[PDB]
Amino acid sequence: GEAPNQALLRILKETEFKKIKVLGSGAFGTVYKGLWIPEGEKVKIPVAIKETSPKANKEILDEAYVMASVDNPHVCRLLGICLTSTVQLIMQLMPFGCLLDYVREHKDNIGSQYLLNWCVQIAKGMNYLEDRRLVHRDLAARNVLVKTPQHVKITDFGRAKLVPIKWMALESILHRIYTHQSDVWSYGVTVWELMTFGSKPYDGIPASEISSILEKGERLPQPPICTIDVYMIMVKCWMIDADSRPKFRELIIEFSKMARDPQRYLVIQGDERMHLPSPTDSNFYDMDDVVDADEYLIP
Numbered sequence: 001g002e003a004p005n006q007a008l009l010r011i012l013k014e015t016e017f018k019k020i021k022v023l024g025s026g027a028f029g030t031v032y033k034g035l036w037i038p039e040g041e042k043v044k045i046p047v048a049i050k051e052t053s054p055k056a057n058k059e060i061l062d063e064a065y066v067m068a069s070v071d072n073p074h075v076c077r078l079l080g081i082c083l084t085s086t087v088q089l090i091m092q093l094m095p096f097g098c099l100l101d102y103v104r105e106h107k108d109n110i111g112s113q114y115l116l117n118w119c120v121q122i123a124k125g126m127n128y129l130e131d132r133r134l135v136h137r138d139l140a141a142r143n144v145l146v147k148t149p150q151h152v153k154i155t156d157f158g159r160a161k162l163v164p165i166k167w168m169a170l171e172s173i174l175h176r177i178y179t180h181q182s183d184v185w186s187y188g189v190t191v192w193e194l195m196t197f198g199s200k201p202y203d204g205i206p207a208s209e210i211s212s213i214l215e216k217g218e219r220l221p222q223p224p225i226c227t228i229d230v231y232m233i234m235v236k237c238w239m240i241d242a243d244s245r246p247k248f249r250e251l252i253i254e255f256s257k258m259a260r261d262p263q264r265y266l267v268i269q270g271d272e273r274m275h276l277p278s279p280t281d282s283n284f285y286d287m288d289d290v291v292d293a294d295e296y297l298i299p
C-alpha cells in the first residue's frame with residue numbers, strides 16, 4: 001500500500017540524564033534544560049525534557065511518534081523518551097528559546113539578512129514536512145526555536161497530521177480543512193510576525209470576527225520594513241484559492257534570491273551594523289565533552 005515507517009524510538013534511562021533548571025512551565029507539564037550522557041560514550045548532550053491521566057500519555061506518545069519520524073535541519077530533533085511514571089520527551093536543546101520572543105527581545109539588533117535567512121530556513125523546514133506528507137497545522141512564530149541566531153528549527157507537532165484562529169487559512173476556519181496549502185497561509189502570518197518584530201496579528205479583533213473580515217478581502221498590513229516584493233509574497237499566501245498560493249519549494253527559491261541583497265528587500269534603520277550572538281564568539285558556549293545533538297548520530 002504505502003511505505004513502512006522504519007524510524008527508531010530510543011528509550012532512555014532516567015539515570016542516563018540529569019535536569020539542570022527549568023526553562024518554563026504551564027500546561028500540565030514542564031520543560032527542563034538538562035544533560036544526557038549516553039552510558040559509556042564519553043559525551044554530554046544538552047537536551048530539553050518535556051513532561052498523568054491516561055489521555056495525557058497517549059497524546060504525548062503521539063507527538064513522539066512524529067518527531068521520531070523526522071530528520072531535517074529545520075525540524076526539531078527528537079532524541080528519545082523516558083518511561084517514568086510520567087512520559088517525558090528528550091529533545092535537542094534549543095538554547096535561544098523561540099523566535100517569537102527572540103525577535104521581540106532583540107528587535108533592534110536583527111538585520112535583514114537574519115530575517116530573510118530565517119524565512120528561507122522555515123520554507124525548507126516545511127518543504128521537508130511536505131516531502132514527508134506532513135501537515136503541521138500550527139506553524140507560527142511561537143513554534144519555531146532558535147539553536148543559534150543563524151539557525152532555527154520548527155517544533156510543536158502537537159497538532160501535526162497527514163485553536164489558533166489568527167494563524168489559519170479560510171477553509172481551515174470554516175470547513176476544518178488542512179493542507180500543506182493551509183500551512184502556506186500560516187507561513188505567511190508567521191512571516192508577517194517576523195517582519196513586524198513580533199507584533200500580534202489582528203491585534204484587536206476577536207477571533208469570532210476574524211473569518212468574516214477575511215471573507216471581505218481584508219488582510220494583515222505591510223510591515224514598515226517591508227518592500228512590496230516581500231509583502232507581495234506574504235499576500236500570495238493569503239489567497240482564498242489555495243492552488244494560487246505558492247509552494248514551500250518556491251518560497252525557498254524566492255527568499256534565497258532576496259538573501260543575496262537583503263538591503264534591497266528589507267529596509268531597517270541602521271540595518272548596516274547589526275550584530276547578534278554567534279558560534280564563532282568566545283562567549284557563546286565545566287562544558288568538557290559537550291557535543292551538539294546534531295553531531296551525535298546512531299550509537
Ligand SMILES: */C=C\C(=O)Nc1cccc(Nc2nc(Nc3ccc(N4CCN(C)CC4)cc3)nc3ccc(F)cc23)c1
Pocket residue numbers: 023024025031048050076091092093094095096097098099100101141142143145155
Ligand atoms: C515563544 C514561545 C515560547 O515561549 N516557547 C518556550 C518557552 C519555554 C520553554 C520552551 N521549550 C523549549 N525551550 C528551549 N530553550 C529555552 C527556553 C527558555 C529560555 N529562556 C532564556 C532566558 N531565561 C533564562 C529564561 C529562559 C531559553 C531557552 N528549547 C527547546 C528545545 C526543544 C523543545 F522541544 C522545546 C524547547 C519553549
